[PDB]
Design a protein around this ligand. Structure first.
Ligand SMILES: [N]S(=O)(=O)[C][C][C]C1234B567B189B21%10B32%11B543B645B786B917B%1021B3%114C6571[C][C][C]S([N])(=O)=O
Ligand SMILES: [Zn+2]
Length: 257
């Protein structure tokens, strides 16, 4: 069973998921001087006004907020994408201390955490079919730095005590993911993969340039979660990030100059 530890972490994943050593793996370091501005890229369209959150879940690798994706209610379009991508869930990756936790890096800089909003292409009908396609998923990645609190995150932080251990879930209705977005939608994009098993090469990554700020108290609550199930030896859910992978033959494009 895969995880983030010494004996089951990212360096081991290739044994069960040989695509881990593939040609389009994520995350990557974003070298800002090498990314080329592409004036043909569109502004990203984020349409979250009718989002319907359902549940919050500790899945043993992160916590996630899940949405109703049975209609086009919370969709990502434009940017580098062709067609319409439905929001399925968001989750986070974070560190044991504020100097690590992000998956993507920017000129080798690591952020305290990274938010991923996972969307799937409606042309494939369901997420399981979408993960088998090179353009099946679009993940919107947002960096978190520690400073001022993010008010729109607090509803999330306040229920984490109720999902401490793997398999726990709770009702989480009426959560508005617009409250997690930075001002600017300027972004980098590149073709990549899921950053957890099965590591499928199905993702168009859209990584926002502008981080959000969260407070030390907010991130400390992330770090009280447990990788373990209830009753098992307590292992803080921290450092649940895959390191940067080889860029290989890929170009990172910037939406901005
Ligand atoms: N039919 S199926 O089980 O392959 C569908 C998998 C859907 C997933 B998988 B689960 B669902 B979707 B895909 B990966 B893991 B959970 B979500 B992405 C998941 C976790 C985040 C991967 S990341 N960090 O690249 O956003
Ligand atoms: Zn993720």
């Amino acid at each position: 069973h895969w995880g983030y530890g010494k004996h089951n972490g990212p360096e081991h994943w290739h044994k069960d998921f040989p695509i881990a050593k593939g040609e389009r793996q994520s995350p990557v370091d974003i070298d800002t001087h090498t990314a080329k501005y592409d004036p043909s890229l569109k502004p990203l369209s984020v349409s979250y006004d009718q989002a319907t959150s359902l549940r919050i879940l500790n899945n043993g690798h992160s916590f996630q907020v899940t949405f109703d994706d049975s209609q086009d209610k919370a969709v990502l379009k434009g940017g580098p994408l062709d067609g319409t991508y439905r929001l399925l869930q968001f989750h986070f990756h974070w560190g044991s201390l504020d100097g690590q936790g992000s998956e993507h890096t920017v000129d080798k800089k690591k952020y305290a955490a990274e938010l991923h909003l996972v969307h799937w292409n409606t042309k494939y009908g369901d997420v399981g079919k979408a993960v088998q396609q090179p353009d099946g998923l679009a993940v919107l990645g947002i960096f978190l730095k520690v400073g001022s609190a993010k008010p729109g995150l607090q509803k999330v932080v306040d229920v984490l005590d109720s999902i401490k251990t793997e398999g726990k879930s709770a009702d989480f209705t009426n959560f508005d993911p617009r409250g997690l977005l930075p001002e600017s939608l300027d972004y980098w994009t590149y073709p990549g993969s899921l950053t957890t098993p099965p590591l499928a090469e199905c993702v168009t990554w859209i990584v926002l340039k502008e981080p959000i700020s969260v407070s030390s108290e907010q991130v400390l609550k992330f770090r009280k979660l447990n990788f373990n199930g209830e009753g098992e030896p307590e292992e803080l859910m921290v450092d649940n990030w895959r390191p940067a992978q080889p860029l290989k033959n890929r170009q990172i494009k910037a939406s901005f100059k």
